[PDB]
Design an enzyme around this catalytic site. Structure first.
Site, PDB file in Angstrom:
ATOM      1  N   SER A  43       0.795  -1.221   0.000  1.00 32.44           N
ATOM      2  CA  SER A  43       0.000   0.000   0.000  1.00 32.44           C
ATOM      3  C   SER A  43       0.833   1.280   0.000  1.00 32.44           C
ATOM      4  O   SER A  43       0.250   2.366  -0.078  1.00 32.44           O
ATOM      5  CB  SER A  43      -0.961  -0.007   1.194  1.00 32.44           C
ATOM      6  OG  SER A  43      -2.002  -0.965   1.018  1.00 32.44           O
ATOM      7  N   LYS A  46       0.272   3.736  -2.926  1.00 28.54           N
ATOM      8  CA  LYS A  46      -0.860   4.652  -3.012  1.00 28.54           C
ATOM      9  C   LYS A  46      -0.407   6.105  -3.061  1.00 28.54           C
ATOM     10  O   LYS A  46      -1.134   6.959  -3.581  1.00 28.54           O
ATOM     11  CB  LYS A  46      -1.815   4.426  -1.839  1.00 28.54           C
ATOM     12  CG  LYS A  46      -2.595   3.124  -1.930  1.00 28.54           C
ATOM     13  CD  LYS A  46      -3.304   2.784  -0.632  1.00 28.54           C
ATOM     14  CE  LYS A  46      -4.055   1.469  -0.758  1.00 28.54           C
ATOM     15  NZ  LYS A  46      -4.243   0.801   0.557  1.00 28.54           N
ATOM     16  N   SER A 103      -5.606   3.788   4.129  1.00 25.21           N
ATOM     17  CA  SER A 103      -5.200   2.676   3.267  1.00 25.21           C
ATOM     18  C   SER A 103      -6.410   1.952   2.681  1.00 25.21           C
ATOM     19  O   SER A 103      -6.436   0.723   2.585  1.00 25.21           O
ATOM     20  CB  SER A 103      -4.288   1.701   4.014  1.00 25.21           C
ATOM     21  OG  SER A 103      -3.105   1.453   3.275  1.00 25.21           O
ATOM     22  N   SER A 210       1.400  -3.224   3.925  1.00 21.46           N
ATOM     23  CA  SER A 210       1.602  -4.577   4.417  1.00 21.46           C
ATOM     24  C   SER A 210       0.917  -5.554   3.476  1.00 21.46           C
ATOM     25  O   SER A 210      -0.055  -5.207   2.801  1.00 21.46           O
ATOM     26  CB  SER A 210       1.074  -4.745   5.847  1.00 21.46           C
ATOM     27  OG  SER A 210      -0.329  -4.920   5.855  1.00 21.46           O
TER      28      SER A 210
HETATM   29  C1  LIG Z   1      -1.738  -2.258   1.506  1.00 21.67           C
HETATM   30  O1  LIG Z   1      -0.709  -2.322   2.126  1.00 21.67           O
HETATM   31  C2  LIG Z   1      -3.020  -2.874   2.033  1.00 21.67           C
HETATM   32  N1  LIG Z   1      -2.780  -4.208   2.509  1.00 21.67           N
HETATM   33  C3  LIG Z   1      -3.609  -5.325   2.021  1.00 21.67           C
HETATM   34  O2  LIG Z   1      -4.491  -5.121   1.228  1.00 21.67           O
HETATM   35  C4  LIG Z   1      -3.349  -6.780   2.538  1.00 21.67           C
HETATM   36  N2  LIG Z   1      -4.202  -7.702   1.825  1.00 21.67           N
HETATM   37  C5  LIG Z   1      -3.668  -6.824   3.997  1.00 21.67           C
HETATM   38  C6  LIG Z   1      -2.683  -7.138   4.913  1.00 21.67           C
HETATM   39  C7  LIG Z   1      -2.981  -7.173   6.258  1.00 21.67           C
HETATM   40  C8  LIG Z   1      -4.271  -6.890   6.691  1.00 21.67           C
HETATM   41  C9  LIG Z   1      -5.261  -6.572   5.771  1.00 21.67           C
HETATM   42  C10 LIG Z   1      -4.965  -6.537   4.432  1.00 21.67           C
HETATM   43  C11 LIG Z   1      -3.615  -1.969   3.197  1.00 21.67           C
HETATM   44  N3  LIG Z   1      -2.557  -1.147   3.733  1.00 21.67           N
HETATM   45  C12 LIG Z   1      -2.017  -1.949   5.207  1.00 21.67           C
HETATM   46  C13 LIG Z   1      -1.278  -1.035   5.974  1.00 21.67           C
HETATM   47  O3  LIG Z   1      -1.232   0.173   5.625  1.00 21.67           O
HETATM   48  O4  LIG Z   1      -0.638  -1.420   7.008  1.00 21.67           O
HETATM   49  C14 LIG Z   1      -3.218  -2.365   5.818  1.00 21.67           C
HETATM   50  C15 LIG Z   1      -2.999  -3.519   6.782  1.00 21.67           C
HETATM   51  C16 LIG Z   1      -3.939  -1.192   6.546  1.00 21.67           C
HETATM   52  S1  LIG Z   1      -4.162  -2.883   4.479  1.00 21.67           S
END
Ligand SMILES: *C(=O)[C@@H](NC(=O)[C@H](N)c1ccccc1)[C@@H]1N[C@@H](C(=O)O)C(C)(C)S1
Length: 260
Positions: A43, A46, A103, A210
């Protein structure tokens, strides 16, 4: 050097692979650890999608107010903000804020669609001089973070240089740059990451990321009061697909960096 030994030390203690890049804009010097290695951005990409829409706003001045529908087919795995506006609309500013400060993955995908696909995001990176960044997929599959996969990756060096040009340089307009800087301040997801390793008197704008294989990322621009600004990139990934997140490694890397 001394910082490289401690960063290499905490990487060994973590069992994963650390990537760090700090740009000291006082002497334009750089401290890097695996700085030319490929890491999944997750993420943290972004920021590039929000900056690319901001660049589009320098000709279409009234773009951030343009409404965009949110409707059930748009929602994916994690949508904390766009979930509240289903069957309603959401302007490009509130989706940019949702993508950066919460996010929101649906907000990302709407940002990506506004640019014409993931190739439009990579295009903006090449225009501002980043040859390493590449966005291949939309959310959530861009977080697969498979080892050796070049898809949706960048290096710590390239992303630190790019984030410096966007938030401190002039790759964007001043109204655009101030808006991205103000957005990165409002981040609500990075309390346990880079911010946790820095002095409390330090104001920080950051974006976390993440994904699978325990990928735990954070890119930040830092303003110590009275000193020249810093940008910090900490990427971290692990051998196990089901590995848990390790935000503590990101804080400890920033603590090792901040002691410089
Ligand atoms: C990008 O980093 C996003 N992560 C995801 O879509 C993963 N599939 C995911 C990991 C863990 C938990 C949920 C989804 C979003 N950005 C992360 C971050 O900024 O730490 C997040 C966990 C908020 S999800």
């Amino acid at each position: 050097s001394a910082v490289q030994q401690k960063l290499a030390a905490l990487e060994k203690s973590s069992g994963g692979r650390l990537g760090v890049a700090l740009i000291d804009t006082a002497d334009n010097t750089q401290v890097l650890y695996r700085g030319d290695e490929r890491f999944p951005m997750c993420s943290t990409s972004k920021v590039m999608a929000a900056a690319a829409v901001l660049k589009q706003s320098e000709t279409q001045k009234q773009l951030l107010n343009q409404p965009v529908e949110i409707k059930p087919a748009d929602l994916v795995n994690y949508n904390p903000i766009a979930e509240k506006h289903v069957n309603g609309t959401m302007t490009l500013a509130e989706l940019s804020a949702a993508a950066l400060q919460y996010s929101d993955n649906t907000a990302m995908n709407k940002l990506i669609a506004q640019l014409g696909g993931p190739g439009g995001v990579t295009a903006f990176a090449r225009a501002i001089g980043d040859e390493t960044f590449r966005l291949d997929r939309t959310a959530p599959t861009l977080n697969t973070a498979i080892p050796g996969d070049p898809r949706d990756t960048t290096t710590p060096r390239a992303m630190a240089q790019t984030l410096r040009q966007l938030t401190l340089g002039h790759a964007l307009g001043e109204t655009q740059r101030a808006q991205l800087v103000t957005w990165l301040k409002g981040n609500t997801t990075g309390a346990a990451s880079i911010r946790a390793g820095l002095p409390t008197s330090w104001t920080v704008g950051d974006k976390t990321g993440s994904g699978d294989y325990g990928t735990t990322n954070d890119i930040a621009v830092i303003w110590p009061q009275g000193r020249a600004p810093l940008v910090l990139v900490t990427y971290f990934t692990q051998p196990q697909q089901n590995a848990e997140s390790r935000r503590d490694v990101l804080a400890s890397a920033a603590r090792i960096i901040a002691e410089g």
